[PDB]
Every structure is written in structure tokens, then in C-alpha cells.
Design a protein around this ligand. Structure first.
Ligand code: ZN
Ligand code: ZN
Ligand code: ZN
Length: 412
């Protein structure tokens, strides 16, 4: 814990540029296909090992998704006229979230596998995002995820993957181990802020010290509205950009914890790697790419969680360091790595950067006819980026939901 968090400053955020074609997701076609007429998916968590390598098992690619039923024929989701209300159904998904798995030989055209956990296994009904880790070539998996309402608790659950020529089955995800919640000295609690953020574990091993760590989304500890914005949060802002309005209400951070040992059964919370006090309230789904001896730290954020007198698009932001604990500098100078285009600002969300440079996201809301929108709840086209020092470049795009493995694990 003998390091300082790196602020993502207001001065950095003032460089954020929407519609830079090197850092903008291609336009989603409003005629996109949907991967299921029975379920919505959104946050997508590819099966990975402790370095971030996407792994297939016996030639089967696997993804875990936040999932909810499409309530097409459910009277509870009809409007006053008795017509299915897709917008109300979709916007209610967070309260219905369950983790499901899908499989494919090809990394696309996903086959639905169903629930990871039987209903009742999760301490909370809501199963919010995290990371599935393939532990070994016997097929053992720890799904790290977030138990939400009551509270917000990082948890994990052990099970097994089994394969055949037909597909993949998950078994034995029966015992959820609660690992930790917000502490109130480093990370903000529900007591301090009814709207606190605490979620989205991403475990990794650092080969430099051999230890097991995890990233998560947090907020900087303190009673809502009381945070002091410091010069270090401001950065070198230009003349006329001193007015921060309500910026003390934006207190996002990328948290870090370290495990007592490689079992990951016991955790010590550490100071955050990145703080965004006075800049953005939500640094969601933090994740690493380890490339060319550097630590590329990515996080997803919203236009509407920026502080007053700052803005940027929905998308993935990022930072790079030579050392796990920093100091970090922002990717592309501003932090923006892949932003939605201004003509379709909500087209996708939950942009997840994999070490092969592929970026997956789910389709949210695309402009349709006049002032109307079409809802996705299905995978967006995969984008390829290159990382070159502290810059990134969009170079290609692929099919809807293309999430191939980087390597294949032969089960013993
Ligand atoms: Zn690996
Ligand atoms: Zn083995
Ligand atoms: Zn947004």
C-alpha cells in the first residue's frame, strides 16, 4: 500500500474528443440481428485465465453474460393499450440480472447454455458483473461476480466446465463465497452514499511478485457531497476552466485488492490505482491488458456521469503504466480509447478490451424512425484496436459478438 493513486484530472478530461475516427466505434446498423428472441444480454464476460488470455476449452469458446428474459407476452410489461413495452422491459433488466453462459466453435453464432447458478444459489437475486476464470486444465472455474441489493459484495463461486461434440455444460456452481464489500476508509459505502458504486471484479496474477490481485469499480470514501477537489484532481486546467460546478459529487475510482494466497479466498483492500474525483462518478468494469511490459488499464464510463463543465462519449477509457501501482498516464492524452459516435451516442455499452486488441460491446439504443429508438440486448460488432505506447488506433471490425479464444486448453 506504499503508492499514491493516479488522478485522471479535469485537465486530462478537457482533452476528450468525440468522433476522432481513430477512437470511435463504427456506426451500428439499426437493422442489427438479435442473438435470441427469448433473452436480453448486455455485459459480456469472456472465459479467461489469470493473465487476461481469452481461453477456449476442447475447441469451445465460452462467454458469460448478464441476462434477463424478454417479456414479449408478459401482461406486466404491456402498456395501458395492452401492447408489449420493450423500453420498460429493457430498462428494468438490472433488477432481473442473472449470469448465463453461451458456447461456440467459431467465437460467434453463440449457442445458449442457460444459467451458471441454479436460482437461489446467489445470496442476492441480482447477479451483477465480474469475471469467469479458468483455474486449470481439469476445467475448474471461479466466477467472480457482484451480489447487489441488499448492499454490494464482491463474491466468487466455484464450478466445472464439461465438453462434448454437442457443446458445453457448467456444473457444481453451488457455493457463493462472499469476499468483501466497501470498507468506508478507502472505498465509499452505502451509508456514505445511497448511490455508491462497488462492483465488477477482475482478478489477475502479477508475475513480477507472483501475487493474485483484483481490480474493481469503487468510489473514493467519504459522505456524499463532502469530497474536497484538490489541485491534483484539477490538473493544469486552462484559464477560464476553474469553475467545477457540482464536480465534488463525481468520485469514481478503480480499486485494487490483493489475495492472501493464490486460492483467492481472503482479500486485503489496497488504495485505488486511478481516482476520478471531480471528473467522473463511474469507472466501471476495470480490466487489464498486459502488453510489451506495460500495464494497460481500461475502464468503461458514461457521458452523463462526467462532472459539470466536462464531457465525453460513452465508451472505454484507459491508462498506461510501466508498473502495476503507477504512475499511470491517460491513453490518447485524454483517456478516451473507444467512444460511441455522436450521431448514435447510446448505440453500445460495456466495451471490453481483450489482449488480442478485440473490443466487444452490447447494443443498447440505436436511433430508428424520427425520434424513436430500437433496443439491442444483443452483441455489437467486435472492433479491433492497436495499442502503440500511450496511443490506440481503430483498425478493423468483425461480426456481431465475435469473441474468439487466444488459446485452446485441452482438458485432462
Ligand atoms: Zn494465459
Ligand atoms: Zn492439470
Ligand atoms: Zn451512458
Amino acid at each position: 500500500f506504499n503508492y499514491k493513486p493516479t488522478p485522471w484530472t479535469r485537465a486530462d478530461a478537457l482533452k476528450v474528443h468525440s468522433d476522432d475516427p481513430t477512437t470511435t466505434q463504427p456506426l451500428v446498423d439499426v437493422a442489427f440481428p438479435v442473438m435470441s428472441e427469448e433473452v436480453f444480454i448486455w455485459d459480456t464476460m469472456p472465459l479467461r485465465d489469470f493473465d487476461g488470455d481469452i481461453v477456449s476449452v476442447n475447441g469451445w469458446c465460452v462467454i458469460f453474460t448478464l441476462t434477463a428474459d424478454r417479456n414479449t407476452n408478459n401482461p406486466d410489461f404491456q402498456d395501458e393499450n395492452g401492447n408489449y413495452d420493450i423500453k420498460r422491459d429493457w430498462e428494468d433488466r438490472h433488477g432481473r440480472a442473472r449470469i448465463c453462459y453461451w458456447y461456440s466453435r467459431t467465437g460467434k453464432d453463440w449457442i445458449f447454455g442457460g444459467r451458471v447458478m441454479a436460482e437461489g444459489v446467489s445470496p442476492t437475486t441480482r447477479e451483477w458483473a465480474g469475471t469467469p476464470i479458468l483455474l486449470n486444465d481439469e476445467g475448474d472455474i471461479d466466477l467472480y461476480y457482484t451480489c447487489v441489493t441488499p448492499g454490494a459484495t464482491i463474491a466468487k463461486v466455484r464450478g466445472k466446465i464439461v465438453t462434448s461434440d454437442e457443446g458445453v455444460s457448467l456444473e457444481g456452481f453451488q457455493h457463493v463465497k462472499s469476499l468483501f464489500s466497501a470498507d468506508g476508509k478507502i472505498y465509499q459505502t452505502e451509508e456514505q452514499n445511497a448511490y455508491w458504486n462497488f462492483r465488477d471484479p477482475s482478478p489477475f496474477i502479477d508475475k513480477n511478485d507472483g501475487k493474485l490481485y483484483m481490480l474493481f469499480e469503487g468510489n473514493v470514501a467519504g459522505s456524499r457531497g463532502t469530497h474536497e477537489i484538490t489541485q491534483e484532481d484539477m490538473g493544469s486546467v486552462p484559464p477560464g476552466y476553474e469553475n467545477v460546478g457540482g464536480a465534488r459529487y463525481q468520485v469514481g475510482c478503480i480499486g485494487l485488492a490483493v489475495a492472501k494466497d493464490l486460492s483467492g479466498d481472503e482479500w486485503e483492500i489496497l488504495p485505488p490505482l486511478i481516482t476520478a474525483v471531480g471528473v467522473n462518478d463511474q469507472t466501471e468494469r476495470p480490466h487489464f491488458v498486459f502488453q510489451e511490459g506495460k500495464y494497460y488499464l481500461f475502464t468503461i464510463s458514461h457521458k452523463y456521469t462526467f462532472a459539470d463543465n466536462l464531457t465525453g462519449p460513452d465508451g472505454v477509457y484507459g491508462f498506461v503504466s510501466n508498473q502495476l501501482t503507477g504512475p499511470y498516464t491517460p491513453m490518447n492524452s485524454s483517456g478516451l480509447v473507444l467512444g460511441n459516435p455522436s450521431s448514435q451516442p447510446f448505440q453500445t455499452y460495456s466495451h471490453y478490451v481483450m489482449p488480442n486488441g478485440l473490443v466487444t460491446s452490447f447494443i443498447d439504443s440505436v436511433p430508428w424512425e424520427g425520434e424513436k429508438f430500437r433496443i439491442g440486448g444483443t452483441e455489437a460488432p467486435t472492433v479491433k484496436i492497436l495499442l502503440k505506447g500511450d496511443r490506440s488506433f481503430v483498425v478493423d471490425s468483425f461480426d456481431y459478438g465475435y469473441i474468439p479464444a487466444m488459446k485452446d486448453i485441452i482438458l485432462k
